[PDB]
């Protein structure tokens, strides 16, 4: 099916900026479609084992998930291609604009909650990678999701890793506990605070990795009491951000939260905002 | 650099298989006598090295070469706080590099722009890496496996050790493992004493 | 020396509700339908109470505090027993 | 050991059978559980909202299954890490959390908020596994462990008494007790240099024979079936590997974690003359 022979080379946002991706326009019927450069050094014995775990990535056609076109190998790198979105990601928009108002935040929360609920209910796949860097926005006004951990063997065989000055892990995760669905809620709440204020909130408004990983575990979780917001937003973030996993609500009981219902019953112009922020 | 074929880094300086590839790809159960002999040779070589006021700043299981039972230690003058350098996404952590660092070194810097040398190396921190080597050579695999970097950093920084669920032997080997991984620097042993401790055979054959 | 709370039955739970927090008398029947025995009295959570039907905030807070006080009072009876066992 | 027992691949029939022994008041929910085909993976991640989709409108009936599920998760996921240092983690973490929260609040002329009592209760609950493992066979024949047990018990008794006695202020007292608890937990984590605090428990298989093996099970409040008062007759310990402190988890290849003591004795006495069990032996040393 898919092969690297028929994929061309097009323009890109940057060269080496963070990770490396490259837009591709298919020669046949002009399929505009992006590519992901994933580089590994693995013996061929487990190569097939990794290869067999990307079919579940294509067997999911929910509206709030980026499409999957195929996967192939070419000269020491695994190539995985997904539908190209002309909007970008929440990181870039956050850096340019500065913050995001309440209504857009509510719509994004609704979209990600629906996507996570679908994934967990249908295939029992835990995202484990939830951050503003994994939410793709289109131009019409849609919201999608990508880069969710499906193949655990790829983690066990990853060539390298990166840490960075921003971490979105959970206090139970840093103490060696297993991965559960309740870990995603903490990261989602932290992301919500990040897009609400404009910066990483863990250092209250630098210093080594350990002094962050131990500040997260011991110090009280951040709160948005220092500015005038909607009360329901504050209670939603409060429920999302709690140290003990048992006090953190499952996704099926924040979908009935008053804030989410208010967001659902309303209607706000996402298309105008996304068009204005980007270059038309 | 003669007694234990110490290498200072095709007629000479030949390269081949190592200890890491041996114990991993071959999956061969090393005999107890071979384990004791290899440990004794490594201890003697490092004790000789420590006597010339030069610090082995990077000891892993890929920096040892075994040829017909003769150990070789190499690449003891390269690693530093500048050799690792990566992009704005954060520090690039190799796959099996965070389980060889003592707690005093695990406090690395995030922005990848440290002025001068961030780390400080001492012979007290070097013997810590010997404990991991013996653990992996007697048990069969690494430590802190199937964990992310952001978890290993915090777990090690608290002063922890992998639970000994895969070892079945006397109290001597476990006592030595606890001796190597001691949280306080000064209470760690020195290679002169460790060679004597390992010389008294815990068991024979 | 009251009996161990782990062995309590329902009747003991309604007696406890009558004695300790008899002021909020319109919610006692809720414990009857939902079968709150001794074991479940320890692990009742704020979400669990909210589900059970304590709509008003103040009454739910008062009941939460009373149950918390009871759970703390039953904790001493374990520490002392373990201390006596340790002394032997 | 591990091959016989798994929890992430349980067929719905096994989940249905295990739930039966939890209580005699849950006979009517077996059919509904069988209909939806709730496997082991879904069982381990059960939540209160889901249980209301199977007709379990009673909170008291929910709590029993929640407790059994939590016990099963604790036994399965952390079987190979249940050592002395791991239990010392929670003793320290909760104390430091409470201390930092109290320092940040900087409250004055106010009563102890219910959240503070909740954290205090959570902290004392974490002491129970530590003391329960400390007073057993590995650490009952040495003086240092006894002194550590006495010190931590004194600190816990002060913690509980100060809170329960009267309201506010005792806030500096509770802060100081938290600091002492944290320091002692750090001492057991780092300073102690004995290799016992590293080795966790282990699994084993035991066969017993129409003689009734007289190990009177003294079930605690948590359903942990611990063997006590092994009869002095020679064959019981000559042919069996049971000892004081041993824990029974499986009968004839069937998990019984979190059950009620009544059915365990009933199952044992109604079992076949030849029986097979799984024992969670206390840590030892293979001195060869
Ligand atoms: C240490 C740690 O947490 N590791 C970890 C933990 C969970 C997830 C990941 N994970 C990841 O982060 N990425 C991002 C970084 C590139 C992946 O792309 C990625 C990936 N591919 C992928 C999947 C779907 C789509 I639509 C696009 C894709 F590209 N597949 C197939 C995975 O199963 C993993 C291994 C990925 C990594
Ligand atoms: N199909 C796509 N559509 C739009 N943007 C894309 C697409 N694929 C990749 N990108 C962008 O490519 C850039 C590099 O992505 P990548 O390095 O894989 O992840 P990241 O979110 O930027 N960083 P990180 O959170 O550390 O993994 C980001 O700005 C993405 O938004
Ligand atoms: Mg990416």
């Amino acid at each position: 099916e898919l092969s690297d022979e028929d994929l061309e080379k097009l323009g890109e946002l940057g060269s080496g900026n963070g990770g490396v991706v490259m837009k591709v326009r298919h020669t046949h019927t002009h399929l505009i479609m992006a590519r992901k450069l994933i580089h590994l050094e693995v013996k061929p014995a487990i190569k097939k084992q990794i290869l067999r775990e990307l079919k579940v990535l294509h067997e999911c056609n929910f509206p709030h998930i980026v499409g999957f076109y195929g996967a192939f190998y070419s000269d020491g790198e695994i190539s995985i291609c997904m539908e190209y979105m002309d909007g970008g990601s929440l990181d870039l928009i956050l850096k340019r604009a500065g913050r995001i108002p309440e209504s857009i935040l509510g719509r994004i929360t609704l979209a990600v909650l629906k996507g996570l609920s679908y994934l967990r209910d249908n295939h029992a796949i835990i995202h484990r990678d939830v951050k503003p860097s994994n939410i793709l926005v289109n131009s019409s006004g849609e919201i999608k999701i990508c880069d969710f951990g499906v193949s655990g063997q790829l983690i066990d065989s990853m060539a390298n890793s990166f840490v960075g000055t921003r971490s979105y892990m959970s206090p139970e995760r840093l103490q060696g506990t297993h991965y559960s669905v309740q870990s995603d809620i903490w990261s989602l709440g932290l992301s919500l605070v990040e897009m609400a204020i404009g910066m990483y909130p863990i250092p209250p408004p630098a210093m080594a990795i350990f002094e962050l990983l131990d500040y997260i575990v011991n110090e009280p979780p951040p709160k948005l009491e220092h500015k005038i917001f909607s009360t329901e937003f504050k209670d939603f973030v409060d429920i999302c951000l709690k140290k003990q996993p048992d006090e953190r609500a499952d996704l099926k009981t924040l979908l009935s939260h008053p804030w989410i219902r208010k967001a659902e019953l309303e209607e706000v112009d996402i298309s105008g905002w996304v068009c204005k922020t980007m270059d038309l | 650099t003669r007694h234990e074929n110490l290498v200072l880094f095709v007629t000479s300086l030949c390269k081949g298989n190592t200890l890491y590839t041996y114990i991993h790809q071959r999956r061969e159960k090393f005999a107890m006598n071979r384990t004791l002999l290899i440990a004794q040779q490594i201890a003697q070589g490092m004790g000789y090295l420590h006597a010339r006021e030069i610090i082995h700043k990077d000891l892993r299981t890929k920096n040892i070469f075994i040829e017909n039972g003769k150990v070789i230690i190499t690449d003891f003058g390269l690693f530093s706080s500048t050799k690792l350098l990566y992009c704005d996404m954060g520090l690039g952590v190799p796959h099996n590099w965070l389980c060889y660092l003592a707690p005093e070194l695990i406090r690395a810097l995030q922005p990848e722009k440290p002025r001068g040398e961030c780390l400080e190396f001492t012979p007290y921190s070097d013997v810590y890496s010997f404990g991991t080597v013996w653990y992996e050579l007697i048990c069969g695999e690494f430590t802190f496996k199937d964990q992310p970097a952001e978890s290993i950093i915090w777990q090690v920084g608290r002063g922890m050790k992998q639970s000994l669920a895969n070892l079945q032997s006397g109290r001597d080997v476990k006592d030595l493992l606890m001796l190597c991984w001691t949280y306080e620097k000064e209470h760690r042993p020195q290679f002169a004493r460790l060679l004597s401790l390992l010389e008294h055979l815990p068991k024979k054959r | 020396r009251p009996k161990a709370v782990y062995l309590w039955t329902v009747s003991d739970v309604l007696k406890w509700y009558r004695r300790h927090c008899g002021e909020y008398t319109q919610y006692e029947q809720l414990f009857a339908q939902h079968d709150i025995t001794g074991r479940a009295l320890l692990r009742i959570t704020d979400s669990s109470l909210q589900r059970m039907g304590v709509t008003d905030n103040r009454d739910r807070e008062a009941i939460w505090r009373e149950i918390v006080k009871q759970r703390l009072k039953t904790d001493i009876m374990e520490i002392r027993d373990m201390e006596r066992l340790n002394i032997y | 050991p591990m091959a016989y027992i798994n929890i992430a691949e349980w067929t719905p029939d096994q989940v249905t059978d295990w739930i039966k022994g939890l209580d005699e008041s849950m006979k009517g929910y077996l059919y509904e559980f069988s209909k939806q085909e709730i496997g082991g993976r879904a069982l381990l991640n059960i939540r209160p909202y889901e249980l209301e989709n199977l007709g379990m409108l009673r909170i008291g009936h929910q709590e029993i299954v929640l407790e059994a599920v939590e016990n099963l998760r604790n036994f399965h996921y952390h079987l190979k890490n249940d050592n002395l240092q791991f239990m010392a983690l929670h003793v320290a973490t909760a104390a430091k959390n409470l201390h930092r929260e109290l320092a940040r609040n900087h409250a004055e002329s106010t009563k102890i908020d219910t959240r503070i009592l909740h954290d205090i209760t959570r902290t004392i609950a974490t002491l129970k596994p530590l003391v329960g493992s400390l007073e057993r066979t590995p650490f009952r024949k040495q003086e240092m462990y006894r002194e550590y047990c006495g010190n931590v018990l004194k600190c816990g008794l002060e913690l509980a008494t100060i809170a329960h006695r009267d309201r506010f202020q005792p806030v500096p007292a509770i802060r100081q007790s938290a600091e002492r608890l944290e320091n002692l937990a750090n001492f057991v984590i780092q300073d102690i240099s004995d290799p016992m605090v590293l080795q966790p428990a282990s699994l084993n298989l035991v066969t017993l024979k129409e003689s009734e093996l007289g190990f009177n099970i003294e079930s605690s409040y948590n359903g942990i079936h611990r063997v006590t008062d092994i009869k002095y007759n020679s064959p019981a310990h000559n042919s069996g590997k049971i000892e004081d402190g041993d824990e029974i988890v499986q009968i004839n290849y069937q998990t019984v974690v979190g059950w009620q003591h009544r059915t365990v004795l009933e199952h044992l006495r109604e079992a076949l003359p030849d029986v097979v069990l799984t024992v969670k032996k206390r840590p030892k040393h293979t001195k060869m």
Side-chain angles (χ1 to χ4, degrees), chain A residues 1-40 42-266 268-279, chain B residues 1-4 6-69 71-112 114-198 200-205, chain C residues 1-72 74 76-80 82-88, chain D residues 1-34 36 38-81 83-100 102-105 107 109 111-142 144-166 170-242 244-269 271-288:
Chain A
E1 28 195 55
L2 269 283
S3 305
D4 198 43
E5 304 282 342
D6 278 343
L7 266 74
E8 264 72 10
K9 145 158 151 180
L10 257 283
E12 187 44 58
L13 278 83
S15 177
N17 297 57
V20 48
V21 297
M22 262 295 268
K23 282 166 38 65
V24 178
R25 160 165 70 237
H26 210 305
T27 50
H28 279 247
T29 48
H30 297 76
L31 265 304
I32 180 67
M33 92 157 199
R35 95 201 292 190
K36 200 77 150 169
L37 274 300
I38 279 305
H39 173 272
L40 271 307
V42 196
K43 34 208 288 196
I46 317 113
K47 176 202 219 282
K48 286 277 197 172
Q49 188 96 319
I50 302 122
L51 268 178
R52 304 321 310 211
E53 305 295 331
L54 288 317
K55 316 304 290 304
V56 196
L57 201 50
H58 102 290
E59 201 78 340
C60 48
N61 314 1
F62 198 80
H64 283 189
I65 278 174
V66 298
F68 183 82
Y69 282 100
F72 50 88
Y73 165 85
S74 61
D75 316 329
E77 301 109 355
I78 282 174
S79 159
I80 277 183
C81 316
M82 81 205 168
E83 144 182 324
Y84 151 73
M85 344 284 296
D86 46 23
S89 90
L90 275 169
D91 289 17
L92 329 170
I93 320 174
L94 157 83
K95 308 205 287 171
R96 324 201 161 91
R99 70 179 74 186
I100 291 191
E102 262 215 320
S103 59
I104 322 313
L105 262 186
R107 175 68 81 91
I108 299 186
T109 53
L110 176 54
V112 201
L113 282 157
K114 284 199 180 182
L116 281 163
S117 82
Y118 159 74
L119 277 149
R120 163 194 72 186
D121 288 34
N122 281 247
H123 260 289
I125 277 171
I126 313 133
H127 217 285
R128 205 168 322 128
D129 300 11
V130 169
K131 35 193 181 190
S133 308
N134 291 344
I135 294 161
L136 311 182
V137 174
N138 202 306
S139 50
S140 62
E142 293 159 77
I143 292 153
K144 304 225 183 192
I145 204 175
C146 79
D147 293 22
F148 48 89
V150 51
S151 153
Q153 218 284 330
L154 207 70
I155 321 161
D156 190 32
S157 169
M158 194 68 90
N160 277 32
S161 174
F162 303 91
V163 154
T165 170
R166 287 142 82 108
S167 181
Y168 295 111
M169 274 206 165
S170 265
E172 50 256 359
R173 293 206 73 194
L174 306 187
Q175 308 187 19
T177 72
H178 74 272
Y179 54 100
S180 69
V181 57
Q182 314 275 173
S183 318
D184 285 340
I185 325 290
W186 156 274
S187 96
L188 184 128
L190 202 31
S191 323
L192 291 199
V193 201
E194 158 185 4
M195 290 160 288
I197 282 296
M199 52 205 57
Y200 197 59
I202 275 300
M207 51 166 208
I209 322 186
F210 186 84
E211 296 203 5
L212 266 291
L213 292 174
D214 201 85
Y215 195 103
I216 270 179
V217 173
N218 314 0
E219 291 270 3
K223 324 172 161 283
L224 319 97
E225 295 144 332
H226 266 92
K227 263 314 290 186
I228 57 154
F229 283 169
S230 95
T231 63
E232 297 86 324
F233 198 15
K234 311 183 141 216
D235 325 288
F236 189 91
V237 183
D238 173 338
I239 271 180
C240 285
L241 290 182
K242 279 212 159 193
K243 291 196 188 292
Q244 208 61 223
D246 80 41
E247 291 158 311
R248 246 181 272 149
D250 192 271
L251 291 106
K252 277 287 186 333
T253 166
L254 318 95
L255 273 173
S256 96
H257 221 267
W259 189 51
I260 290 305
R261 304 274 97 169
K262 286 193 33 195
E264 163 69 69
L265 72 86
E266 222 75 89
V268 192
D269 306 348
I270 296 273
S271 64
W273 162 85
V274 58
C275 275
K276 167 259 163 188
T277 306
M278 321 305 317
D279 47 298
Chain B
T1 72
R2 205 275 298 150
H3 207 37
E4 273 311 321
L6 209 33
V7 152
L8 313 95
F9 188 29
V10 285
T11 188
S12 299
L13 265 65
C14 59
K15 311 138 276 298
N17 79 18
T18 171
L19 181 73
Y20 154 78
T21 206
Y22 220 101
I23 70 150
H24 275 29
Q25 324 276 26
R26 263 40 156 178
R27 311 251 165 177
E28 186 76 23
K29 308 170 184 176
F30 267 20
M32 210 41 202
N33 306 1
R34 272 253 291 259
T35 325
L36 263 305
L37 261 290
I38 291 168
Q40 284 189 9
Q41 299 186 192
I42 293 163
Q44 265 199 38
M46 282 306 288
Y48 164 100
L49 185 34
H50 277 298
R52 283 81 191 290
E53 291 56 10
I54 47 184
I55 299 156
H56 194 154
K57 324 199 192 46
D58 166 292
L59 180 45
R60 325 159 91 91
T61 207
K62 334 181 48 175
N63 303 351
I64 296 175
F65 293 90
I66 300 185
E67 301 285 40
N68 208 8
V71 86
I72 280 185
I73 303 200
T74 166
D75 288 342
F76 62 98
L78 309 186
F79 200 90
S80 100
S81 172
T82 282
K83 225 73 174 206
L84 49 94
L85 182 126
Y86 282 96
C87 78
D88 59 344
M89 255 159 75
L91 154 74
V93 174
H95 199 17
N96 272 278
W97 175 70
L98 266 188
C99 80
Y100 280 91
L101 291 203
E104 321 96 340
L105 294 188
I106 215 68
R107 322 208 187 200
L109 257 287
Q110 88 274 17
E112 201 74 320
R115 311 316 310 126
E117 261 176 50
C118 63
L119 305 192
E120 149 202 35
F121 279 79
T122 53
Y124 287 132
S125 46
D126 158 61
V127 51
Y128 191 107
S129 297
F130 177 78
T132 308
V133 163
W134 211 43
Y135 170 78
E136 95 161 16
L137 205 162
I138 195 72
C139 92
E141 206 144 350
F142 273 80
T143 86
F144 289 85
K145 73 188 322 323
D146 287 342
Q147 312 242 7
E150 294 155 83
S151 157
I152 281 173
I153 285 176
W154 194 87
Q155 274 157 219
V156 152
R158 193 90 193 132
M160 303 252 199
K161 308 136 195 72
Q162 167 155 68
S163 295
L164 275 82
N166 314 333
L167 291 73
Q168 327 76 329
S169 285
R171 202 196 140 176
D172 35 35
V173 301
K174 307 185 178 52
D175 197 15
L176 181 175
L177 263 42
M178 192 87 155
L179 273 190
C180 293
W181 295 335
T182 309
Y183 191 63
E184 268 307 313
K185 316 217 312 302
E186 294 85 70
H187 302 97
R188 264 182 213 110
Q190 289 228 135
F191 276 93
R193 168 161 145 78
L194 256 181
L195 173 60
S196 54
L197 271 186
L198 271 162
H200 284 65
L201 305 173
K203 266 303 192 184
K204 45 183 173 72
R205 284 84 197 155
Chain C
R1 186 197 60 85
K3 214 162 51 163
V5 198
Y6 186 81
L7 290 174
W8 269 5
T9 82
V10 198
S11 324
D12 296 56
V13 177
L14 318 88
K15 249 163 64 158
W16 177 102
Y17 200 105
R18 180 129 305 136
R19 160 169 319 132
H20 276 3
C21 206
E23 174 173 356
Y24 301 97
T25 193
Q26 42 164 320
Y27 291 47
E28 30 197 301
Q29 73 293 30
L30 289 183
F31 286 32
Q33 313 164 0
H34 296 238
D35 176 287
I36 300 273
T37 82
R39 305 176 50 180
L41 186 59
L42 300 179
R43 305 163 37 78
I44 174 186
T45 62
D46 194 22
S47 175
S48 165
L49 253 174
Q50 157 79 72
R51 279 149 81 213
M52 252 158 64
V54 282
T55 304
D56 206 341
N57 314 327
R58 334 301 311 291
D59 310 1
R60 179 186 23 199
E61 143 177 326
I63 289 162
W64 190 238
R65 200 182 206 170
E66 291 285 13
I67 296 188
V68 152
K69 264 163 191 93
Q70 168 54 45
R71 189 147 82 263
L72 190 60
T74 204
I76 289 194
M77 298 330 264
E78 320 156 306
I79 279 308
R80 262 159 190 192
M82 267 170 325
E83 192 174 49
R84 164 201 91 61
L85 217 44
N86 158 245
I87 285 174
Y88 72 83
Chain D
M2 183 281 258
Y4 304 143
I5 178 174
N6 191 299
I7 325 290
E9 61 77 16
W10 267 5
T11 85
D13 202 5
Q14 307 170 287
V15 201
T16 293
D17 192 281
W18 170 72
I19 282 190
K20 168 186 281 280
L22 251 67
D23 204 298
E24 281 67 350
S25 95
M26 281 175 4
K27 275 173 52 176
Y29 303 146
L30 286 197
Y31 164 79
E32 182 36 79
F33 269 73
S34 174
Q36 301 213 39
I38 295 193
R41 171 153 270 100
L43 175 77
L44 290 177
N45 295 287
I46 203 60
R47 295 300 318 278
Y49 76 88
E50 164 154 25
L51 278 157
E52 306 220 48
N53 274 333
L54 319 88
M56 265 207 231
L57 287 310
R58 310 187 101 72
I59 267 70
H61 273 78
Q62 287 187 357
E63 285 303 302
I64 309 185
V65 178
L66 276 204
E67 276 283 71
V69 156
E70 186 255 17
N71 250 22
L72 204 58
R73 263 213 328 274
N74 245 13
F75 154 80
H76 174 225
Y77 274 20
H78 319 325
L79 162 70
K80 276 168 269 193
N81 300 348
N83 80 6
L84 256 296
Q85 301 187 241
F86 190 179
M87 311 166 174
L89 254 181
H90 322 87
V91 174
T93 304
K96 222 181 152 141
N97 282 244
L98 162 54
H99 159 227
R100 293 308 299 165
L102 279 176
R104 274 214 90 86
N105 204 290
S109 310
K111 319 297 196 165
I112 321 154
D113 199 2
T114 85
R115 343 170 291 170
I116 314 298
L117 294 293
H118 201 186
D119 324 298
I120 289 180
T121 312
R122 291 281 173 141
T123 287
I124 296 182
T126 41
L127 265 85
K128 282 176 195 165
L130 175 72
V131 186
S133 189
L134 252 181
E135 87 200 341
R136 281 189 210 127
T137 283
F139 321 113
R140 90 173 320 273
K141 296 319 220 173
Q142 323 200 31
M144 171 36 48
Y145 303 120
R146 291 209 273 265
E147 183 47 288
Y148 191 37
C149 269
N151 303 144
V152 72
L153 259 293
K154 151 82 168 310
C155 199
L157 213 178
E158 170 136 300
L159 213 59
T161 278
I162 284 325
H164 149 252
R165 212 166 48 182
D166 296 83
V171 170
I174 193 85
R175 228 164 57 115
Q176 186 260 7
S177 199
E179 298 335 278
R180 166 152 313 116
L181 190 41
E182 152 90 348
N183 276 0
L184 270 304
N186 271 14
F187 159 83
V188 75
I189 275 192
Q190 313 173 150
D191 184 28
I192 278 179
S193 61
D194 269 312
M196 221 56 58
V197 316
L198 281 158
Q199 178 152 351
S202 47
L203 262 56
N204 202 314
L205 270 77
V206 152
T207 166
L208 303 177
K209 309 150 196 175
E210 213 248 355
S211 184
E212 335 171 299
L213 267 307
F215 54 105
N216 267 2
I217 301 179
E218 172 48 47
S219 307
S220 82
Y221 297 152
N222 287 308
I224 295 333
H225 314 101
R226 145 183 193 180
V227 164
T228 50
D229 287 8
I230 167 58
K231 93 191 182 312
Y232 199 67
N233 299 59
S234 180
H237 53 107
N238 178 270
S239 54
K241 319 302 269 198
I242 318 286
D244 179 299
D246 288 342
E247 188 190 336
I248 283 159
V249 155
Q250 254 188 313
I251 293 94
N252 254 358
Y253 283 41
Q254 170 104 346
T255 326
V256 316
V257 177
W259 269 5
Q260 263 191 356
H261 32 54
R262 213 280 305 292
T263 166
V264 202
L265 325 158
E266 163 163 88
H267 218 170
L268 276 161
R269 64 161 321 290
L272 306 187
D274 281 345
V275 70
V276 165
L277 284 87
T278 279
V279 197
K280 202 224 277 171
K281 298 288 306 181
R282 276 305 262 185
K284 285 291 302 291
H285 274 318
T286 89
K287 36 195 57 183
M288 326 211 163

